[PDB]
Amino acid sequence: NQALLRILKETEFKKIKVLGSGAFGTVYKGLWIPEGEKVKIPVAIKELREATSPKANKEILDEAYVMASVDNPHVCRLLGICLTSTVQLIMQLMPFGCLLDYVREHKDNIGSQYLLNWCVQIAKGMNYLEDRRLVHRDLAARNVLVKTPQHVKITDFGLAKVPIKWMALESILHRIYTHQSDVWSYGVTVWELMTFGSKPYDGIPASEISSILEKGERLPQPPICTIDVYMIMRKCWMIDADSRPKFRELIIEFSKMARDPQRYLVIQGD
Numbered sequence: 001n002q003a004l005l006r007i008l009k010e011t012e013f014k015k016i017k018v019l020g021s022g023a024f025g026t027v028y029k030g031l032w033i034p035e036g037e038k039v040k041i042p043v044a045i046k047e048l049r050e051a052t053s054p055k056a057n058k059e060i061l062d063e064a065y066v067m068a069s070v071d072n073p074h075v076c077r078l079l080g081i082c083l084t085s086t087v088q089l090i091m092q093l094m095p096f097g098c099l100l101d102y103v104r105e106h107k108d109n110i111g112s113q114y115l116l117n118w119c120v121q122i123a124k125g126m127n128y129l130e131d132r133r134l135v136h137r138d139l140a141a142r143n144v145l146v147k148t149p150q151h152v153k154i155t156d157f158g159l160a161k162v163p164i165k166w167m168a169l170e171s172i173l174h175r176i177y178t179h180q181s182d183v184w185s186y187g188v189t190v191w192e193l194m195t196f197g198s199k200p201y202d203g204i205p206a207s208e209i210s211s212i213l214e215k216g217e218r219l220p221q222p223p224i225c226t227i228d229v230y231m232i233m234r235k236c237w238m239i240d241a242d243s244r245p246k247f248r249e250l251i252i253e254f255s256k257m258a259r260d261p262q263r264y265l266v267i268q269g270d
């Protein structure tokens with residue numbers, strides 16, 4: 001369905017402010033001003049580094065069509081693309097930033113129902129990706145964006161088509177990426193939220209992660225988590241990928257807990 005993806009001319013968007021930058025490229029805050037209309041749309045613009053892959057513009061556009069077909073309230077949808085020497089991707093601006101920064105900045109004013117609702121919404125978005133037979137490969141708290149405080153969206157997937165501390169052991173050892181390896185990354189993401197933005201395996205070099213996982217060590221239990229919540233996180237980190245919970249089960253379990261949030265999370269002033 002080609003109509004779902006707007007082909008943009010360079011004059012229809014302008015870069016205002018830099019939001020993030022790295023080896024992939026740079027994400028700008030900007031405005032989309034379609035020529036015919038009289039509107040200025042807040043957007044995020046990710047410009048990819050030139051000459052990173054041999055894929056021509058024709059093959060890139062076909063992959064972009066898939067990203068534009070993602071229709072789920074908890075997964076970011078590709079709004080437009082600009083194909084010059086560099087590939088530029090346009091999506092809606094998420095004004096509150098990424099969820100990792102949000103929980104760090106508001107760690108004193110976040111209650112149990114907020115945290116459990118985020119866990120539900122992230123599981124809903126990942127379950128949709130699994131329904132579309134799409135593997136994310138880089139699920140993390142930094143890759144969950146906050147549209148409003150109680151509406152989050154998963155971002156930065158399909159860009160892949162090394163985050164060792166978020167990867168399932170089979171991804172580190174065998175480069176295997178499935179929906180069940182996404183579940184491992186979901187467990188680490190939930191761990192980031194329950195610790196209000198702590199770094200996983202803090203103080204341990206990335207090159208040592210596989211050995212400690214093979215020795216049976218895992219991320220420690222967050223203090224606010226009751227045993228019911230931690231055991232769900234621990235099951236996401238089982239060696240047997242098919243023994244890990246499914247995203248559809250995680251939706252049900254975290255939805256049930258969200259009905260009685262103070263029973264499952266113990267938070268000061270909650």
Ligand SMILES: COc1cc(N2CCC(N(C)C)CC2)ccc1Nc1ncc(C(=O)Oc2ccccc2)c(-c2c[nH]c3ccccc23)n1
Pocket residue numbers: 019020021027029044045046076089090091092093094095096097098101145155156
């Ligand atoms: C006010 O808006 C924001 C601000 C801040 N800042 C606040 C604090 C700063 N200091 C003080 C700590 C640093 C951070 C972060 C985020 C957003 N909102 C946003 N909206 C939409 C996308 C997004 O969909 O981008 C795309 C676009 C096309 C294709 C794929 C992804 C993104 C986004 C996705 N991947 C990224 C990688 C790096 C940076 C941003 C993004 N972010």
Ligand SMILES: [Cl-]
Pocket residue numbers: 106109110149
């Ligand atoms: Cl808040």
Ligand SMILES: [Cl-]
Pocket residue numbers: 199
């Ligand atoms: Cl960090």
